[PDB]
Design an enzyme around this catalytic site. Structure first.
Site, short mmCIF file in Angstrom:
data_model
loop_
_atom_site.label_atom_id
_atom_site.label_comp_id
_atom_site.label_asym_id
_atom_site.label_seq_id
_atom_site.Cartn_x
_atom_site.Cartn_y
_atom_site.Cartn_z
N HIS G 61 0.85 -1.22 0.00
CA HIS G 61 0.00 0.00 0.00
C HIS G 61 0.87 1.25 0.00
N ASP G 91 11.15 21.83 -24.92
CA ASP G 91 11.03 20.51 -24.27
C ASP G 91 11.89 20.52 -23.00
N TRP G 126 7.09 -0.26 4.92
CA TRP G 126 7.76 0.40 3.78
C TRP G 126 9.18 0.86 4.14
N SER G 156 15.15 6.17 -11.66
CA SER G 156 14.15 6.95 -12.43
C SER G 156 14.14 8.38 -11.91
N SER G 157 13.94 8.53 -10.60
CA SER G 157 13.80 9.85 -9.98
C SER G 157 15.11 10.66 -9.99
N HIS G 240 12.82 11.52 5.57
CA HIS G 240 12.20 12.82 5.90
C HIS G 240 12.21 13.70 4.63
N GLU G 242 12.01 12.76 1.66
CA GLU G 242 11.00 12.14 0.81
C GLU G 242 9.61 12.73 1.10
N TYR G 244 8.83 15.72 2.11
CA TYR G 244 8.84 17.10 1.53
C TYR G 244 8.78 17.01 -0.01
N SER G 255 -0.61 26.90 -4.93
CA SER G 255 -0.35 28.35 -5.18
C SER G 255 -0.99 28.75 -6.53
N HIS G 290 13.72 12.38 14.21
CA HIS G 290 12.38 12.38 14.83
C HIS G 290 11.62 11.08 14.51
N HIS G 291 12.14 10.25 13.62
CA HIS G 291 11.57 8.92 13.32
C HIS G 291 12.17 7.87 14.27
N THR G 316 6.40 27.04 6.80
CA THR G 316 5.14 26.41 6.36
C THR G 316 3.96 27.37 6.65
N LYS G 319 3.50 30.01 4.12
CA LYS G 319 2.78 29.56 2.91
C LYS G 319 1.29 29.54 3.19
N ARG G 438 0.67 0.47 15.43
CA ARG G 438 0.75 0.29 13.97
C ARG G 438 1.01 -1.16 13.60
C1 HEA Z 1 3.43 14.77 2.84
C2 HEA Z 1 3.88 14.07 3.83
C3 HEA Z 1 4.34 14.63 5.11
C4 HEA Z 1 4.55 15.95 5.49
C5 HEA Z 1 4.55 17.18 4.69
C6 HEA Z 1 4.88 15.83 6.93
C7 HEA Z 1 5.19 16.95 7.70
C8 HEA Z 1 5.60 16.96 9.07
N1 HEA Z 1 5.72 15.83 9.81
FE1 HEA Z 1 5.37 13.92 9.27
N2 HEA Z 1 5.19 12.02 8.62
C9 HEA Z 1 4.81 11.56 7.41
C10 HEA Z 1 4.46 12.42 6.29
C11 HEA Z 1 4.53 13.83 6.33
N3 HEA Z 1 4.91 14.57 7.37
C12 HEA Z 1 4.88 10.13 7.27
C13 HEA Z 1 4.57 9.26 6.13
C14 HEA Z 1 5.28 9.68 8.55
C15 HEA Z 1 5.45 8.26 9.05
C16 HEA Z 1 6.65 7.56 8.52
C17 HEA Z 1 6.53 6.10 8.93
O1 HEA Z 1 6.90 5.83 10.13
O2 HEA Z 1 6.07 5.25 8.12
C18 HEA Z 1 5.40 10.91 9.32
C19 HEA Z 1 5.95 10.86 10.63
C20 HEA Z 1 6.35 12.02 11.39
C21 HEA Z 1 7.03 11.93 12.70
C22 HEA Z 1 7.51 10.65 13.36
C23 HEA Z 1 6.45 10.22 14.41
C24 HEA Z 1 6.72 8.81 14.91
O3 HEA Z 1 6.92 7.89 14.07
O4 HEA Z 1 6.65 8.65 16.16
C25 HEA Z 1 7.19 13.28 13.11
C26 HEA Z 1 7.98 13.66 14.29
O5 HEA Z 1 8.27 14.83 14.50
C27 HEA Z 1 6.62 14.11 12.00
C28 HEA Z 1 6.51 15.54 12.08
C29 HEA Z 1 6.12 16.33 10.98
C30 HEA Z 1 6.23 17.77 11.08
C31 HEA Z 1 6.64 18.63 12.23
C32 HEA Z 1 5.87 18.21 9.78
C33 HEA Z 1 5.84 19.65 9.34
O6 HEA Z 1 6.45 19.73 8.04
C34 HEA Z 1 4.37 20.16 9.38
C35 HEA Z 1 4.41 21.67 9.30
C36 HEA Z 1 3.04 22.29 9.10
C37 HEA Z 1 2.33 22.99 9.99
C38 HEA Z 1 2.78 23.22 11.40
C39 HEA Z 1 0.95 23.47 9.60
C40 HEA Z 1 0.86 24.88 9.00
C41 HEA Z 1 1.47 25.93 9.83
C42 HEA Z 1 0.78 26.97 10.37
C43 HEA Z 1 -0.68 27.19 10.11
C44 HEA Z 1 1.62 27.99 11.18
C45 HEA Z 1 1.30 28.06 12.63
C46 HEA Z 1 1.72 26.77 13.30
C47 HEA Z 1 2.37 26.64 14.46
C48 HEA Z 1 2.80 27.80 15.27
C49 HEA Z 1 2.64 25.26 15.04
N4 HEA Z 1 5.97 13.31 11.08
C1 HEA Z 2 0.51 8.89 -0.63
C2 HEA Z 2 0.52 8.10 0.42
C3 HEA Z 2 -0.70 7.47 0.97
C4 HEA Z 2 -2.08 7.58 0.66
C5 HEA Z 2 -2.75 8.43 -0.34
C6 HEA Z 2 -2.74 6.64 1.58
C7 HEA Z 2 -4.14 6.45 1.53
C8 HEA Z 2 -4.91 5.57 2.36
N1 HEA Z 2 -4.32 4.80 3.36
FE1 HEA Z 2 -2.38 4.66 3.83
N2 HEA Z 2 -0.44 4.51 4.25
C9 HEA Z 2 0.60 5.15 3.75
C10 HEA Z 2 0.54 6.07 2.63
C11 HEA Z 2 -0.68 6.47 2.04
N3 HEA Z 2 -1.88 5.97 2.39
C12 HEA Z 2 1.90 4.82 4.35
C13 HEA Z 2 3.22 5.36 4.02
C14 HEA Z 2 1.58 3.87 5.39
C15 HEA Z 2 2.50 3.17 6.38
C16 HEA Z 2 2.96 1.83 5.81
C17 HEA Z 2 3.78 1.06 6.88
O1 HEA Z 2 3.35 1.10 8.08
O2 HEA Z 2 4.89 0.52 6.55
C18 HEA Z 2 0.15 3.79 5.25
C19 HEA Z 2 -0.56 2.99 6.18
C20 HEA Z 2 -1.97 2.89 6.25
C21 HEA Z 2 -2.69 2.29 7.40
C22 HEA Z 2 -2.06 1.73 8.68
C23 HEA Z 2 -1.85 0.23 8.54
C24 HEA Z 2 -1.28 -0.39 9.82
O3 HEA Z 2 -0.51 0.31 10.55
O4 HEA Z 2 -1.58 -1.61 10.06
C25 HEA Z 2 -4.08 2.42 7.05
C26 HEA Z 2 -5.15 2.01 7.93
O5 HEA Z 2 -6.31 2.30 7.73
C27 HEA Z 2 -4.15 3.10 5.75
C28 HEA Z 2 -5.33 3.35 5.04
C29 HEA Z 2 -5.36 4.19 3.87
C30 HEA Z 2 -6.67 4.50 3.29
C31 HEA Z 2 -8.00 3.97 3.70
C32 HEA Z 2 -6.35 5.43 2.24
C33 HEA Z 2 -7.34 6.06 1.35
O6 HEA Z 2 -7.53 7.42 1.81
C34 HEA Z 2 -6.99 5.89 -0.09
C35 HEA Z 2 -8.21 6.42 -0.92
C36 HEA Z 2 -7.86 6.57 -2.35
C37 HEA Z 2 -7.27 7.63 -2.86
C38 HEA Z 2 -6.82 8.73 -2.00
C39 HEA Z 2 -7.07 7.78 -4.39
C40 HEA Z 2 -5.89 7.29 -4.94
C41 HEA Z 2 -5.70 7.56 -6.46
C42 HEA Z 2 -5.38 8.67 -7.14
C43 HEA Z 2 -5.16 10.00 -6.45
C44 HEA Z 2 -5.23 8.51 -8.65
C45 HEA Z 2 -6.07 9.61 -9.29
C46 HEA Z 2 -6.23 9.46 -10.79
C47 HEA Z 2 -5.90 10.46 -11.60
C48 HEA Z 2 -5.33 11.77 -11.10
C49 HEA Z 2 -6.10 10.29 -13.07
N4 HEA Z 2 -2.84 3.31 5.25
CU LIG Z 3 10.20 13.05 9.14
#
Ligand code: HEA
Ligand code: HEA
Ligand SMILES: [Cu+2]
Ligand SMILES: CCCCCCCCCCCCCCCCCC(=O)OC[C@H](COP(=O)([O-])OCC(O)COP(=O)([O-])OC[C@@H](COC(=O)CCCCCCCCCCCCCCCCC)OC(=O)CCCCCCCCCCCCCCCCC)OC(=O)CCCCCCCCCCCCCCCCC
Ligand SMILES: CCCCCCCCCCCCCCCCCC(=O)OC[C@H](COP(=O)([O-])OCC(O)COP(=O)([O-])OC[C@@H](COC(=O)CCCCCCCCCCCCCCCCC)OC(=O)CCCCCCCCCCCCCCCCC)OC(=O)CCCCCCCCCCCCCCCCC
Ligand SMILES: CCCCC/C=C/C/C=C/C/C=C/C/C=C\CCCC(=O)O[C@H](COC(=O)CCCCCCCCCCCCCCCCC)COP(=O)(O)OCCN
Ligand SMILES: CCCCCC/C=C\CCCCCCCCCC(=O)O[C@H](COC(=O)CCCCCCCCCCCCCCC)COP(=O)(O)OC[C@@H](O)CO
Ligand SMILES: CCCCCCCCCCO[C@@H]1O[C@H](CO)[C@@H](O[C@H]2O[C@H](CO)[C@@H](O)[C@H](O)[C@H]2O)[C@H](O)[C@H]1O
Ligand SMILES: CCCCCCCCCCO[C@@H]1O[C@H](CO)[C@@H](O[C@H]2O[C@H](CO)[C@@H](O)[C@H](O)[C@H]2O)[C@H](O)[C@H]1O
Ligand SMILES: CCCCCCCCCCO[C@@H]1O[C@H](CO)[C@@H](O[C@H]2O[C@H](CO)[C@@H](O)[C@H](O)[C@H]2O)[C@H](O)[C@H]1O
Ligand SMILES: CCCCCCCCCCO[C@@H]1O[C@H](CO)[C@@H](O[C@H]2O[C@H](CO)[C@@H](O)[C@H](O)[C@H]2O)[C@H](O)[C@H]1O
Ligand SMILES: C[C@H](CCC(=O)O)[C@H]1CC[C@H]2[C@@H]3[C@H](O)C[C@@H]4C[C@H](O)CC[C@]4(C)[C@H]3C[C@H](O)[C@]12C
Ligand SMILES: C[C@H](CCC(=O)O)[C@H]1CC[C@H]2[C@@H]3[C@H](O)C[C@@H]4C[C@H](O)CC[C@]4(C)[C@H]3C[C@H](O)[C@]12C
Ligand SMILES: CCCCCCCCCCCCCCCCCCCC
Ligand code: CUA
Ligand SMILES: [Ca+2]
Ligand SMILES: [Mg+2]
Ligand SMILES: [Zn+2]
Lengths: 44, 143, 227, 70, 72, 56, 513, 40, 44, 102, 49
Positions: G61, G91, G126, G156-157, G240, G242, G244, G255, G290-291, G316, G319, G438
């Site tokens: 998934h 291009d 993953w 690829s990337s 991390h 990744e 961003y 935007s 932080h992970h 952030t 933005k 999890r």
């Molecule tokens: C698009 C994906 C994405 C993005 C952008 C982020 C953004 C951030 N993530 Fe997240 N994160 C994940 C995807 C993402 N993360 C995934 C996939 C994991 C799990 C990995 C795994 O274990 O599988 C995860 C896990 C993860 C952890 C590990 C937790 C754990 O495993 O125990 C932490 C720890 O600090 C973290 C923090 C943050 C923070 C601080 C941001 C910041 O960038 C967020 C900043 C944004 C804001 C704060 C909101 C807007 C701001 C305002 C409106 C201003 C005012 C706000 C304040 C004064 C607070 N995330």
């Molecule tokens: C991009 C990343 C992404 C997205 C979108 C999702 C979407 C969803 N995920 Fe998650 N998920 C993860 C990344 C994502 N996930 C990751 C990183 C983990 C952790 C894995 C691990 O623990 O190792 C995770 C784990 C995870 C868990 C925890 C499992 C566990 O700990 O046992 C669950 C549980 O409900 C869940 C559910 C779902 C559901 C119901 C959706 C739904 O919201 C999905 C609904 C469908 C969509 C959002 C549409 C998708 C398609 C398109 C957008 C194509 C569009 C077509 C055109 C543009 C032409 N996912």
């Molecule tokens: Cu991180």
């Protein structure tokens, strides 16, 4: 090469029913695959 | 006025409240009577009839502000259709419950839950706020 | 343990878990307020026919947008780091217990005095006694003295595991070749539950932790009886 | 005759009014939350522990048959 | 260009200084001075210093710099 | 050796509509056919190998 | 002709189209995997099997949603279609290498589906941590096929990043400085720099895992003096950045969408938006541990990673506030794309704020490896990255195809998906705070109510995904051809018509100094 | 945006067919697998 | 200059503007930037 | 200042040989500002419409005054009141008098 | 000229709302779903030992 709407794609949109079949097969195959993989793992 | 794909690179007509005077007239080609009306427009506008004034507006513009800004009933279709598809989703959940989901574990049976509840109260699960805090140990009943 | 329809943390059993509840309350108020303000401002920006579409000057407003968030982050970090360093403070434990993760059960070693060790396995659903909790009970509980500072050392003899007890604020990864330390102090007697918190294969869901907190005299007699 | 109304800065006027309203509301929420969640929690823990007898709690648990060790 | 280096000055460099200034200004408190021990490898005096009474270092701080005979 | 670049410039600029990977002449077609045959045939073999490896 | 055009492409638009088709197909696979997860969790007791088949599904998934859906759509699809048009370039810099970035993905995907078909699958997460991912606890080919899948996706990337950076630096009109490029172009340049620096470290780490599994190395095996925690540092040094990489192109699309449907010529605070994205990119490299707050690192290290992580909220927030300031005074058009973008601003903010909760190492002790983390990342991925993809898709579909969507159907789609994703993920906060771990196939009985509601949510989202397929069909079936597009003066990608000719900017734009 | 009327209009009945076929293409194969889980 | 009868112009109306204003310039009478009014004339 | 802004816009529209492009540029620019234009500005734009023999644009200018006022329903009637002598002199019918408010 | 929404919007809103409520109420109450609500104020504790 053909230019314009319906011509800049690798699939035909000349017939909407043939297209529905192609889209059904395309998206349906992706959605089905995990169910058939789980079935495969369970049947070992 | 017929708008053509092959005119994409030319200035075009828009109705937008933030762009009141668009780049071209709505109607560029004029009939004999419309040509005579544009000549009449070079003289006093007091001499134009209401109908002539409306005709001049409708050559220059497609819709009025009132027309382009009107509200629609689209929200009813969107909300109704969304509720229909959410309703359809419950049919999938009914199918899943009937054909996929077998019996739930025996720990959800009423008698098991009654005994487990007493054992949680005997070990004082969450006695400050969460669970046992809600039990009156003096009166032997929920608060 | 958790209860049905629970919204927040398990009730605190240790002073540090109490500290974490108040710190979470403080942080969540801020999260609520910021979420609410963004939703409100969106709704405000979208509910007027009045327009202003010419270039707008950004530098004055960006000062507010950076300084106010910076202040808020400091107001979160200060209590956050106070708690982090409080958990790290020197305490002087009375007892050291080791736990070793395995596929799929925990072993416990109490070797301050005698060679006491045993394995702790989930009770299968088919063998639960009336009133016992599915997936949470074990055959052999981790008996410990209440109101005493305990050093827990955690490792693994196979893959990663993680030893967690939410109501005491504990989660320490179990890594082969590594001995990780945490401190455990229960304010109360009772039974405190946790679950393996690192993916470890086929029975990750099924290797729980049950602490049994009792007075020192009872702990001493249990210890003697387990040799 | 109609009086001259305000014709300039209508959007800016509306923004100022509502941003001040939102600050005022944020302050009322912070005060409500202090009372309804944070202080309630502090008081629940302080009240529970003020006269708490851990031995009495243990004896009740022991007599209910919960323990392996007692 | 100048625009890019100004952008780095105000967007990266001076924010870094501000963050390090905040960090330092948080750990600015005076530390508990350590017990005096008259170690022979410290408070070296092979010749009097050419200022004061000859026994004080140039940026002598009474709070943290003991003399050979100890804290003033 | 002698500079024969001008002779290659004439060959590769000939207005014959050939894409650059075939513009050297018949040897290019042969090497292309060998490459694509090994690629497509190897890919079919990799799928057979998956079929085989998917079962005990 | 078909082979020359679609297998041998050197055209940025056709290659973009191939990426969008690939990503759409990958999205269906990822959605089916997500529904298998929620079908298991929607009732207590075991449905499918023990945790192995369950975690094969969870692992797949994540890899599918990240590597095969989000990155190919945002970077390969929107990036290839839009970046050259937005800078007036004819291009990409390396138009043949671009084609190889695309064609590496079907093989990468095949290796992932092979991983799941052979032996018992890769039930690793993953993150693929050893020793569970090692040759004792995961004997046989599954994890090696997963590693090779990631190698091909990485190449690829990396090549795509080289292509985007070179194109954006080198192929603008000579009068156009970097400070006159659109925000989407900046978002792709910054994403590409993150890919260039992060993926090679992943490649090193998974190569070490491959050699531990097959060549008797012991990088991660304590018996040889290795350390499983070293793998975690190498993985997260990539991981991390990744996340961003997953969001930045989304920020660039948001935007453009907010500006466009506000009736504005320009986003509020352009240079602040550029500053914010570069600050997020930079800070994204110094926060990875932080992970790892529960692995046993030193207190001062935990204090640093807490503090550095929280700092990301400042750029952030600039933005988020700048998007709100772009709406301010707009002539708002309530298009379907605008609805996706407004959903993004709010739901991304919620997920960012739960990230700030997690950044606190003391609280992360209790939240780590729980559903609180799952709630955080699905708000930012399933309601952030995905909402930006859907907003950009409905906004630019008429550019790419020359046909219009039915706006009423697109609004219905948005409404259903909004309900489904919120019903799915909001209750996972409660599961996390109350301690549900999890990667569990089954849970103690107390967690039943929220898991039941969460699963019901996932079925609503499935209904939305099925409707989206129908909506794309109806657009191609009806053939409503585009006539006029507003605001072309500040949206260059539209100015060559819908769709643009195969070759655009054969004669470049004129821009003087 | 402005656009031409549909070159090949899709009537309500045709949309019901497209929507039905699309949903069945997702639901029937998964349905068959999940129905037969006990057998696997 | 153009090799055809229309070319896209981008106008950076003031120095350091981040916003470029884009439009087709057609053979014939000079056209004006719709933002700053600057005149452009095609020389095919 | 307000008076300087208004005087610049009156001058803009009062240019005797203002062309159609300049009339449109002026109105399309003016409606981007956070204000409903003063009657003296609208008066000058309506007289430019007359020099350009463009009755329709004069009506459209009155519509956009109403539109820029948003929910402030008192502004448009006030502006029409202040313009009545100019509307009478030039024979400009309001959108309301033409039925174009329906 | 009335559009689709003028002709059918009222019926789509009323039928969609009615259908949605009916099917979700049936699903939630009539087919044996285990919600596992709180025992607080609901369950009479019973001797277990
Ligand atoms: C698009 C994906 C994405 C993005 C952008 C982020 C953004 C951030 N993530 Fe997240 N994160 C994940 C995807 C993402 N993360 C995934 C996939 C994991 C799990 C990995 C795994 O274990 O599988 C995860 C896990 C993860 C952890 C590990 C937790 C754990 O495993 O125990 C932490 C720890 O600090 C973290 C923090 C943050 C923070 C601080 C941001 C910041 O960038 C967020 C900043 C944004 C804001 C704060 C909101 C807007 C701001 C305002 C409106 C201003 C005012 C706000 C304040 C004064 C607070 N995330
Ligand atoms: C991009 C990343 C992404 C997205 C979108 C999702 C979407 C969803 N995920 Fe998650 N998920 C993860 C990344 C994502 N996930 C990751 C990183 C983990 C952790 C894995 C691990 O623990 O190792 C995770 C784990 C995870 C868990 C925890 C499992 C566990 O700990 O046992 C669950 C549980 O409900 C869940 C559910 C779902 C559901 C119901 C959706 C739904 O919201 C999905 C609904 C469908 C969509 C959002 C549409 C998708 C398609 C398109 C957008 C194509 C569009 C077509 C055109 C543009 C032409 N996912
Ligand atoms: Cu991180
Ligand atoms: C694990 C793997 C991962 C899989 C990833 C899947 C995603 C891949 C992405 C790339 C898509 C494929 C396109 C390139 C090559 C495909 C070759 C092929 O089969 O072509 C036939 C086929 C189209 O058939 P057509 O309509 O008959 O062709 C008209 C041609 O003009 C007329 O052309 P012609 O007459 O010259 O010749 C056409 C003829 C002969 O053409 C040739 O000469 C080519 C022969 C060699 C082709 C080799 C390439 C194969 C593709 C690689 C990956 C698969 O082809 C055929 O008709 C028969 C071919 C049948 C093979 C089907 C393969 C298609 C993809 C497979 C889907 C996934 C299956 C996995 C199964 C999983 C099981 C667990 O192409 C497609 O597959 C297109 C996709 C199907 C329609 C979906 C549309 C959805 C729209 C969503 C919107 C998103 C876009 C938004 C923007 C839109 C505007 C810009
Ligand atoms: C379309 C979508 C469909 C709906 C999706 C599913 C709906 C879920 C329903 C939840 C209702 C729960 C319930 O049984 O309510 C009774 C429950 C009984 O009250 P209580 O047991 O005294 O709860 C007080 C707790 O002890 C208070 O202390 P605690 O420690 O027990 O509570 C902490 C807890 C509690 O937090 C909550 O109660 C969540 C409130 C929901 C926000 C709306 O959880 C959280 O931290 C939640 C994390 C949320 C992340 C941030 C969300 C951003 C907010 C967006 C702002 C927009 C405003 C409009 O009433 C509620 O509090 C309603 C919730
Ligand atoms: C604040 C930022 C830095 C400021 C720099 C220094 C300020 C004062 C002196 C200026 C010249 C410095 C150059 C280097 C010379 C030697 C010592 C300088 C370092 C200094 O300032 O060190 C001080 C001692 O200075 C001392 O002895 C006495 C210092 C004064 C006498 C110096 C005489 C020696 C000169 C040697 C000249 C050689 C030149 C080389 C030429 C080469 C050409 C071929 C340290 O204070 P302290 O109390 O011991 O400890 C602190 C306790 N709280
Ligand atoms: C376990 C086994 C897994 C291994 C999988 C291996 C993956 C794929 C197989 C590779 C097949 C490579 C075939 C040769 C590719 C040459 C690319 C090239 O040389 O590309 C050049 C551009 O990149 C440039 O310069 C500079 C960049 C050139 C990079 C070239 C090749 C890279 C291959 C691997 C890179 C990974 C990096 C390792 C570090 C992480 C040319 O660009 P084009 O668009 O062609 O032309 C443009 C025209 O104007 C030229 O006249
Ligand atoms: C859980 C998430 C739920 C999502 C809910 C989605 C609801 C969809 C609403 C669609 O309804 C329509 O919306 C138009 C806009 O899309 C309105 O335009 C009207 O009102 C606007 C004022 O904002 C004007 O701009 C327009 O000109 C005007 O026609 C129109 O009347 C209304 O019927
Ligand atoms: C958090 C979202 C709230 C958004 C707030 C945005 C504030 C924007 C104000 C800047 O625009 C200004 O408006 C003035 C007229 O009022 C002009 O005179 C001035 O030239 C211009 O710079
Ligand atoms: C252009 C198209 C591309 C060409 C594709 C060619 C495919 C045909 C290759 C022949 O297949 C081989 O069969 C051998 C069976 O004899 C295998 O031997 C291997 O397996 C044997 C099993 O008996 C062992 O003795 C040894 O490991 C080893 O010899 C070997 O793995 C395998 O490759
Ligand atoms: C998470 C994604 C999936 C969500 C749920 C999908 C909803 C299910 C759609 C219907 O699927 C079908 O259900 C039938 C039963 O209703 C099955 O027939 C089965 O049962 C019939 C009636 O007993 C027999 O006649 C058939 O032979 C037998 O296959 C049939 O195979 C299957 O395609
Ligand atoms: C100097 C640079 C570019 C200005 C330009 O050339 O247009 C601008 C763009 C974004 C600005 C920054 C952002 O607006 C965010 C911060 C806002 C604060 O009010 C000052 C510091 C702050 C970090 C700003 C410093 C500086 O003014 C920056 C970096
Ligand atoms: C004779 C030939 C002339 C090349 C030319 O100008 O065409 C010369 C010039 C430089 C020579 C090469 C260089 O002298 C370097 C090498 C010297 C070795 O002794 C022989 C091989 C060696 C690689 C030479 C081969 C050959 O004799 C070259 C290539
Ligand atoms: C003009 C080029 C702009 C690219 C800037 C990229 C900003 C991201 C910085 C990442 C640095 C990480 C170092 C490790
Ligand atoms: Cu042991 Cu998970
Ligand atoms: Ca289950
Ligand atoms: Mg962990
Ligand atoms: Zn200009």
């Amino acid at each position: 090469y053909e230019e314009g709407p319906g011509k800049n794609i690798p699939f035909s949109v000349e017939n909407k029913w043939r297209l529905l079949a192609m889209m059904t097969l395309f998206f349906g195959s992706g959605f089905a695959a995990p169910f058939f993989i789980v079935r495969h793992q369970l049947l070992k | 006025s017929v708008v053509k794909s092959e005119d994409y690179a030319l200035p075009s007509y828009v109705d937008r409240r933030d762009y009141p005077l668009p780049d071209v007239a709505h109607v560029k080609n004029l009939s004999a009577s419309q040509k005579a009306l544009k000549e009449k427009e070079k003289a006093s506008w007091s001499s134009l009839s209401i109908d002539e004034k409306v005709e001049l507006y409708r050559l220059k513009f497609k819709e009025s502000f009132a027309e382009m800004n009107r509200s629609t009933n689209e929200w009813k279709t969107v909300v109704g259709a969304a509720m229909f598809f959410i309703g359809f989703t419950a049919l999938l959940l009914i199918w899943e419950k009937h054909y996929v989901y077998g019996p739930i574990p025996h720990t959800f049976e009423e008698e098991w839950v009654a005994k487990q509840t007493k054992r949680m109260l005997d070990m004082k699960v969450a006695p400050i706020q969460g669970f046992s805090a809600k039990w009156d140990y003096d009166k032997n009943e929920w608060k | 343990m958790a209860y049905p329809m629970q919204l927040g943390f398990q009730d605190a059993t240790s002073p540090i878990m109490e500290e974490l509840l108040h710190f979470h309350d403080h942080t969540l108020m801020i999260v609520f307020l910021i979420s609410s303000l963004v939703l409100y401002i969106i709704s405000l920006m979208l509910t007027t026919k009045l327009t202003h579409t010419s270039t707008m000057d950004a530098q004055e407003v960006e000062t507010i947008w950076t300084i106010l968030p910076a202040i808020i982050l400091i107001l979160i970090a200060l209590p956050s780091l106070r708690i982090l360093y409080m958990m790290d403070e020197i305490n002087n434990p009375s007892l050291t217990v080791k736990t070793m993760g395995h596929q799929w059960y925990w072993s416990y070693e109490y070797t301050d005095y005698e060679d006491l060790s045993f394995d702790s396995y989930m009770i299968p659903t088919s063998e639960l006694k009336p009133g016992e909790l599915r997936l949470l009970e074990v055959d052999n509980r981790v008996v410990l003295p209440m109101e005493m500072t305990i050093r827990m050392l955690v490792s693994s003899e196979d893959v990663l595991h993680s030893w967690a007890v939410p109501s005491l604020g504990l989660k320490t990864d179990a890594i082969p070749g590594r001995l990780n330390q945490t401190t455990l102090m229960s304010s109360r007697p009772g039974l405190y539950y946790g679950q393996c918190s690192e993916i470890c294969g086929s029975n990750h869901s099924f290797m729980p932790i049950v602490l049994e907190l009792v007075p020192l005299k009872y702990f001493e007699k249990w210890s003697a009886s387990m040799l | 005759a109609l009086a001259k109304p305000q014709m300039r800065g209508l959007l800016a006027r509306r923004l100022r009014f509502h941003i001040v309203g939102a600050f005022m509301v944020s302050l009322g929420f912070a005060t409500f939350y202090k009372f309804a969640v944070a202080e309630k929690r502090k008081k629940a823990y302080a009240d529970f522990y003020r006269n708490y007898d851990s031995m009495k709690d243990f004896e009740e648990m022991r007599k209910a048959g919960i323990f392996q060790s007692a | 260009g100048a625009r890019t280096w100004r952008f780095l000055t105000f967007g990266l460099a001076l924010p870094s200084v501000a963050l390090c200034t905040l960090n330092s200004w948080l750990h600015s408190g005076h530390r508990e001075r350590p017990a005096f021990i008259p170690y022979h490898h410290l408070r070296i005096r092979t010749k009097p210093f050419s200022w004061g009474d000859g026994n004080h270092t140039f940026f002598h701080n009474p709070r943290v710099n003991p003399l050979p005979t100890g804290y003033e | 050796f002698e500079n024969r670049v001008a002779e290659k410039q004439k060959l590769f600029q000939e207005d014959n509509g050939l894409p650059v990977h075939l513009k050297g002449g018949a040897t290019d077609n042969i090497l292309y056919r060998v490459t694509m045959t090994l690629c497509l045939g190897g890919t079919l073999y990799s799928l057979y190998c998956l079929g085989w490896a998917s079962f005990p | 002709m078909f082979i020359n055009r679609w297998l041998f492409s050197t055209n940025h638009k056709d290659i973009g189209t191939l990426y969008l088709l690939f990503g759409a197909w990958a999205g269906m696979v990822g959605t089916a995997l997500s529904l298998l997860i929620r079908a298991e969790l929607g009732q207590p007791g075991t449905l499918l099997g023990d945790d192995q088949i369950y975690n094969v599904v969870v692992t797949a998934h994540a890899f599918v949603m990240i590597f095969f859906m989000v990155m190919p759509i945002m970077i390969g699809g929107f990036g290839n279609w839009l970046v050259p048009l937005m800078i007036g370039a004819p291009d990409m810099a390396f138009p043949r290498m671009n084609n190889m970035s695309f064609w590496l993905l079907p093989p990468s995907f095949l290796l992932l589906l092979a991983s799941s078909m052979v032996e018992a699958g890769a039930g690793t997460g993953w993150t693929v941590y050893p020793p569970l991912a090692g040759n004792l606890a995961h004997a046989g080919a599954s994890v090696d096929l997963t590693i090779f899948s990631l190698h091909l996706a990485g190449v690829s990337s990396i090549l795509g990043a080289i292509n985007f950076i070179t194109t954006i630096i080198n192929m603008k009109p000579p009068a156009m400085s970097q400070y006159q490029t659109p925000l989407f172009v900046w978002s792709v340049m910054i994403t590409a720099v993150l890919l260039l620096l992060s993926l090679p470290v992943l490649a090193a780490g998974i190569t070490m895992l491959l050699t531990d599994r097959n060549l008797n190395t012991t990088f991660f095996d304590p018996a040889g003096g290795g350390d499983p925690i070293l793998y975690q540092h190498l993985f997260w040094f990539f991981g991390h950045p990744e996340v961003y990489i997953l969001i930045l192109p989304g920020f660039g699309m948001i935007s453009h969408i907010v500006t466009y449907y506000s009736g504005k010529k320009e986003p509020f605070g352009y240079m602040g938006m550029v500053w914010a994205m570069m600050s997020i990119g930079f800070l994204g490299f110094i926060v990875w541990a932080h992970h790892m707050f529960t692995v046993g690192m030193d207190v001062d290290t935990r204090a640093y990673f807490t503090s550095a992580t929280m700092i990301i909220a400042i750029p952030t927030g600039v933005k988020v506030f700048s998007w709100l300031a772009t709406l301010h005074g707009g002539n708002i058009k309530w298009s379907p794309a605008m609805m996706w973008a407004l959903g993004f601003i709010f739901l991304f903010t919620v997920g960012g704020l739960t990230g700030i909760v997690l950044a606190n190492s003391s609280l992360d002790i209790v939240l780590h490896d729980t559903y609180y983390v799952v709630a955080h990342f699905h708000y930012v991925l399933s309601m952030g990255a995905v909402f930006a993809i859907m907003g950009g898709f409905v906004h630019w579909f008429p550019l790419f195809s020359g046909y219009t969507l039915n706006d009423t159907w697109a609004k219905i789609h948005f409404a259903i998906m909004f309900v489904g994703v919120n019903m799915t993920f909001f209750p996972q906060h409660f599961l996390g705070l109350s301690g549900m771990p999890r990667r569990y196939s089954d849970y103690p009985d107390a967690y039943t109510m929220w898991n039941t509601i969460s699963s019901m949510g996932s079925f609503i989202s499935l209904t939305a995904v099925m409707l989206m397929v129908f909506i794309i069909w109806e657009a191609f079936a009806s053939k409503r051809e585009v006539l006029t597009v507003d605001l072309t003066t500040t949206n260059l990608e539209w100015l060559n018509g819908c769709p643009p000719p195969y070759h655009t900017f054969e004669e470049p734009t004129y821009v003087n100094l | 945006i402005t656009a031409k009327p549909a070159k090949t209009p899709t009537s309500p009945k045709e949309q019901a067919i497209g929507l039905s076929v699309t949903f069945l293409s997702f639901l029937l194969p998964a349905g068959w697998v999940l129905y037969h889980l006990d057998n696997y | 200059p153009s090799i055809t009868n229309k070319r896209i112009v981008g106008c950076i109306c003031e120095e350091d503007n981040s916003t470029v204003i884009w439009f087709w310039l057609h053979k014939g009478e000079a056209q004006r930037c719709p933002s700053c009014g600057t005149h452009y004339k095609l020389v095919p | 200042t307000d008076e300087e802004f208004d005087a610049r816009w009156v001058t803009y529209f009062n240019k005797p040989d203002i062309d159609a492009w300049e009339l449109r540029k002026g109105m399309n620019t003016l409606v981007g500002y956070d204000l409903v234009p003063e009657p003296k500005i609208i008066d000058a734009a309506l007289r430019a419409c007359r020099r350009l023999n463009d009755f329709a644009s004069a009506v459209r200018i009155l519509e956009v005054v109403k539109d820029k006022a948003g929910p402030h329903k008192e502004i448009y009637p006030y502006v029409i009141q202040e313009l009545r002598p100019t509307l009478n002199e030039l024979g400009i019918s309001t959108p309301e008098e033409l039925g174009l408010d329906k | 000229a009335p559009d689709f929404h003028d002709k059918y919007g009222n019926a789509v809103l009323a039928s969609g709302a009615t259908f949605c409520v009916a099917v979700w109420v049936y699903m939630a109450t009539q087919i044996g779903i285990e919600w596992n609500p709180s025992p607080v104020g609901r369950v009479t504790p019973k001797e277990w030992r």
